Amino acid sequence: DSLVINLNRSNPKLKDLYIRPNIAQKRMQGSLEAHVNGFRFTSVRGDKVDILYNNIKHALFQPCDGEMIIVLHFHLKNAIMFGKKRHTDVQFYTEVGEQMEREMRHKLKTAFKNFIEKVEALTKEELEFEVPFRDLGFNGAPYRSTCLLQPTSSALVNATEWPPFVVTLDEVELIHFERVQFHLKNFDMVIVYKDYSKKVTMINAIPVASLDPIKEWLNSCDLKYTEGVQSLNWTKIMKTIVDDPEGFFEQGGWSFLE
Numbered sequence: 001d002s003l004v005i006n007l008n009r010s011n012p013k014l015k016d017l018y019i020r021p022n023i024a025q026k027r028m029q030g031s032l033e034a035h036v037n038g039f040r041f042t043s044v045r046g047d048k049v050d051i052l053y054n055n056i057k058h059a060l061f062q063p064c065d066g067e068m069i070i071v072l073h074f075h076l077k078n079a080i081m082f083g084k085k086r087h088t089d090v091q092f093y094t095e096v097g098e099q100m101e102r103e104m105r106h107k108l109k110t111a112f113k114n115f116i117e118k119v120e121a122l123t124k125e126e127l128e129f130e131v132p133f134r135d136l137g138f139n140g141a142p143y144r145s146t147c148l149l150q151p152t153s154s155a156l157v158n159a160t161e162w163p164p165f166v167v168t169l170d171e172v173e174l175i176h177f178e179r180v181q182f183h184l185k186n187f188d189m190v191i192v193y194k195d196y197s198k199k200v201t202m203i204n205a206i207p208v209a210s211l212d213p214i215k216e217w218l219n220s221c222d223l224k225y226t227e228g229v230q231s232l233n234w235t236k237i238m239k240t241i242v243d244d245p246e247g248f249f250e251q252g253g254w255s256f257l258e
Contacts, residue, residue, distance in 0.1 A: 003050040004036040011035055012118040014072075014111065017092040020162050023047045023083045032072070032092050034119045039074075041092065049082050051090060053125040058166060060152065061116060061129040062159045063109050069093045070108045072116075072129070073159040075166045089164050132157060136217050138210045140189065140203035149203065151217060167191055167201060169221055176257055177211065177227035187211060187227075190234060196242050200234040226257040 012034040018027050019041055030043035038052035055077050062071040073091035080087055097104040116129045132150035139146050147161050151169075158165040176190040186208060191201040206214070218225050241248045 001037070001052060003038045003040055003052065005040070006036055009036075012115050012122070014092070014115045016094055017041070017072075018094070019043065019049065020091050020093065021083055021085070021087055021089075023049065032115075034115070034122055036122075037124075047082075049080075049090065051076070051080070053123055053127050055080070056125075056127060057168070058152070058155050058157075059127060059129045060155075060157055060159055060166075061112065061131050063112070063131065064096050064105050065109075066134065067096075067160055069095050069160060070105075070112055071159045072112065073157075073164065073166075075155070075164075075168075089166060091159060091164065130154060136213075138206060138214055140206040140210075142201065142203050146205065151221075169223065171195065172223055174254060174257075175218055175223055175225040176232075177225060178231045179229065180208075180211070180227040181229045184208060188231065189214070190232075192234075192238075196238055196245065198238075200238065226254075228257065 014032045016029060017032050018029055020027070022028065023043055024045065024047070028043045028045060028047070030041050030047070032039055032041050037054070038050055041049040041051075051074055056074050057077045058075040060071070060073040060075070062069075062073065064070040071091055071093040073089065076088050076090065080090070094108055096108070120127060120129070130152040132152050134150055137148050137150040139148055141147070142149070142158070142165050143163065147158050147165070149156055149158055149165060154169060156165070156167045156169065171193055173192045173194045176192065178188040178190060180187050186205045189203040189206055191203070193200070215225060
């Protein structure tokens with residue numbers, strides 16, 4: 001459906017936000033307004049990006065605590081098209097200013113929180129912003145460099161770096177830890193999905209001291225894990241399973257990881 005706007009209503013509005021990913025060649029600011037059935041971001045150039053509430057899979061609030069930006073991040077059910085591309089993730093952030101930083105952080109957190117509270121009261125949809133559990137975070141490299149991965153109630157996320165990282169916990173089949181070997185400094189974490197046509201998600205080079213805390217968190221989520229010494233070719237593995245799931249589970253299925 002399309003965005004429904006009531007022009008006679010006072011609509012919650014958050015100003016001075018950068019959109020990521022870009023609409024234009026370079027990054028662009030605008031305002032995010034909460035309307036009857038979705039958000040509209042209007043850039044300073046008048047570009048409009050609409051996000052319907054019922055198209056939001058996860059709404060994340062990343063406060064600027066221990067961070068240099070504050071972020072509202074939307075992981076979508078169905079990709080939307082803007083900036084000449086299809087996007088499953090769209091976010092809006094403000095950078096903490098250049099002691100005028102301590103005050104600013106409080107100012108920004110208050111504004112974002114107040115916006116969230118008003119929005120959550122507008123919605124027919126059970127829209128709810130999730131704040132990450134920073135105490136349960138761990139460091140690893142899903143892409144090029146080490147970043148902080150944080151659990152939420154429903155997901156494992158990083159929204160401060162781009163491209164973002166979002167894994168829906170309910171969609172995970174199992175976790176497999178690789179390069180778990182006597183006296184290695186780090187290990188790799190393989191996220192396997194219940195949808196076996198979906199390629200696994202890697203988090204590489206996690207320091208070994210994080211292994212037990214991660215296992216405790218996984219255990220609390222009822223997410224099953226295994227561990228082995230060798231690195232596996234998950235492109236081949238998932239193709240093997242897809243091509244013959246019956247034969248795979250006839251041979252004990254995922255017990256080959258145990």
